[PDB]
């Protein structure tokens, strides 16, 4: 475990904060909602035309959203290399630049890489807003007028709960706090030991690895609440009273929320799965150094 070899954990949100871009495919949670709406349209004959939208408008968007990330892939490799010299003290010695000047480039390169993923999909952002609005216009095709049946909407919730049951939320909840406790235990130790040791290169390499680790935990913690918000609300609707027939315009709002809430759960599960693997990996790096720190002070 010399250095980190995966940097798929970075993400960025727009200023309006409605859209979160992840490096993991589909890169957008709304595509998962679009994929999940296709399940809705299969049961209703009136929305059978939606398959053309999915075959063309949404499928091209996934390929187009993925391509915009590829332009940032080259800038990603530039940033990725900067971490390796910063995190490894023996590699940092060859560079022989100040720790702060090497840190300043990283911070500017961190936003620049963050900025590329955000800026390249800006034209794509208007598309996802255009697709789901088109689906709102398509939902006027249902042959109901204040008598829309809620069966299909409710048969999906009992199936979703089973899909909800597969993911173990409680194991993830234990993972973060214990790791975050070790994160705390590392940092508060460093603030008092930095005065004790005179060489900073080895402890600065940790201090960087710790600072980046703190960034990774927030992405895990943020997604966990949204997955927790997705399990709670969908489960609460199953607890709530179920009417067979609702308004046409209201059924549109019914369909959107479950797919909206479910898409975040699907999206969070992918990021949560990757984030812990990067979290335990950074924990593996912080510890191979801790052994290197103690041995040198002995002699």
């Amino acid at each position, epitope marked *: 475990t010399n250095t980190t070899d995966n940097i798929d954990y970075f993400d960025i949100s727009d200023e309006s904060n409605y859209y979160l871009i992840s490096q993991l495919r589909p890169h957008f949670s709304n595509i998962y909602f679009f994929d999940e709406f296709k399940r809705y349209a299969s049961y209703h004959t009136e929305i059978k*035309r939606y398959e*053309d939208i999915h075959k063309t408008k949404v499928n091209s968007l996934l390929n187009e959203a993925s391509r915009a990330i590829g332009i940032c892939n080259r800038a990603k490799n530039t940033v990725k290399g900067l971490i390796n010299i910063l995190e490894n003290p023996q590699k940092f010695k060859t560079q022989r630049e100040s720790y702060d000047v090497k840190l300043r480039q990283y911070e500017e390169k961190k936003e620049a890489f963050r900025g590329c993923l955000l800026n390249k999909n800006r034209k794509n952002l208007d598309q996802i807003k255009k697709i789901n609005n*088109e689906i709102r216009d398509l939902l*006027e095709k249902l*042959k*109901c007028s204040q008598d829309c049946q809620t069966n299909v909407y409710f048969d999906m919730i009992k199936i979703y709960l089973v899909d909800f049951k597969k993911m173990p939320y409680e194991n993830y909840d234990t993972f973060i706090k214990q790791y975050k406790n070790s994160y705390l235990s590392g940092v508060d130790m460093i603030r008092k030991i930095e005065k004790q040791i005179d060489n900073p290169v080895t402890i600065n390499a940790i201090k960087f690895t710790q600072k980046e680790m703190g960034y990774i935990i927030d992405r895990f913690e943020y997604h966990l609440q949204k997955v927790k918000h997705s399990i709670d609300q969908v489960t609460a609707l199953s607890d709530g009273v179920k009417p067979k027939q609702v308004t046409k315009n209201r059924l549109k709002e019914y369909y959107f929320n479950i797919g909206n809430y479910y898409s975040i759960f699907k999206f969070g599960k992918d990021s949560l799965n990757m984030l812990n693997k990067a979290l335990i990996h950074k924990e593996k790096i912080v510890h191979n150094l801790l052994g290197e720190l103690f041995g040198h002070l002995e002699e």
Partner: antibody, heavy 119, light 102 residues
Framework: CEVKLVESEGGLVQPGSSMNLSCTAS????????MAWVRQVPDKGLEWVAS????????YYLDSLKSRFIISRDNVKNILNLQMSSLKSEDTATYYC???????????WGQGTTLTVSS | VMTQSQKFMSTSIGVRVSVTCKAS??????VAWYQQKPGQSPKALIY???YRNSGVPDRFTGSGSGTEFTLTISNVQAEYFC?????????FGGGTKLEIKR
């Protein structure tokens, strides 16, 4: 700036086909909206002719007209194309180029082209 | 597949006027209304019975669900077509020309 649809003649043709129609779209993104044509007769507009998907892969033809009509669309040049074979005195028509919403309603209409088929 | 229309109607400026369209197998909200001038292209003002496009004067309204539909307009200055876009074929009503009393 303004959404509009232009059309080609039109005019007298012989029963043995020999007629093609084109349509120009401007002021909007061609790819997002479907493209349909509509047929017209003195007493009309009941009958409707084909429409073409965004990609251009799937198209629906009138059962009566499926054998003698082919539709195509040029997304690149913003052109909607109609192909007719073995024209008949029933095919005599005015044709209005239309934009088709997702709800299959025709939100915008072209100026129209008048076709006459006889001997 | 379903289609109806009715005979022409005669009204004068300026009163409210209904146009009657029925048909045979419930299309729900799936109806469209187009206005055709005597020598100009058809223009769509009403889709889904109760919804009107932009660029459509406020006097034009629509109503009805299921099998029967009507179009009422409060004021007046030609021929109007009701359509089902729900299922193939997508047929318009024969249309009712408008005349002015005198």
């Amino acid at each position: 700036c303004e959404v509009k649809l232009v059309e080609s003649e039109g005019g007298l043709v012989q029963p043995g086909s020999s007629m093609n129609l084109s349509c120009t779209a401007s002021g909007f993104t061609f790819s997002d909206y479907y493209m349909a044509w509509v047929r017209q007769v003195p007493d009309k507009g009941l009958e409707w002719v084909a429409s073409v998907s965004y990609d251009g892969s799937i198209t629906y033809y009138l059962d009566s007209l499926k054998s003698r009509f082919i539709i195509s669309r040029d997304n690149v040049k913003n052109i909607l194309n109609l192909q007719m074979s073995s024209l008949k005195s029933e095919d005599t028509a005015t044709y209005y180029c239309t934009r088709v919403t997702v709800v299959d309603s025709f939100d915008y209409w072209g100026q129209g082209t008048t076709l006459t088929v006889s001997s | 597949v379903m289609t109806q229309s009715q005979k022409f109607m005669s009204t004068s400026i300026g009163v409210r006027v209904s146009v009657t369209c029925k048909a045979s197998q419930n299309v729900g909200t799936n109806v469209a209304w187009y206005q055709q001038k005597p020598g100009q292209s058809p223009k769509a003002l009403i889709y889904s019975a109760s919804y009107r496009n932009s660029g459509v004067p406020d006097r034009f309204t629509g109503s009805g669900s299921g099998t029967e539909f009507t179009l009422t307009i409060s004021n007046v200055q030609a021929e109007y077509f009701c359509q089902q876009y729900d299922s193939y074929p997508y047929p318009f009503g024969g249309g009712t020309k408008l005349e002015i009393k005198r």
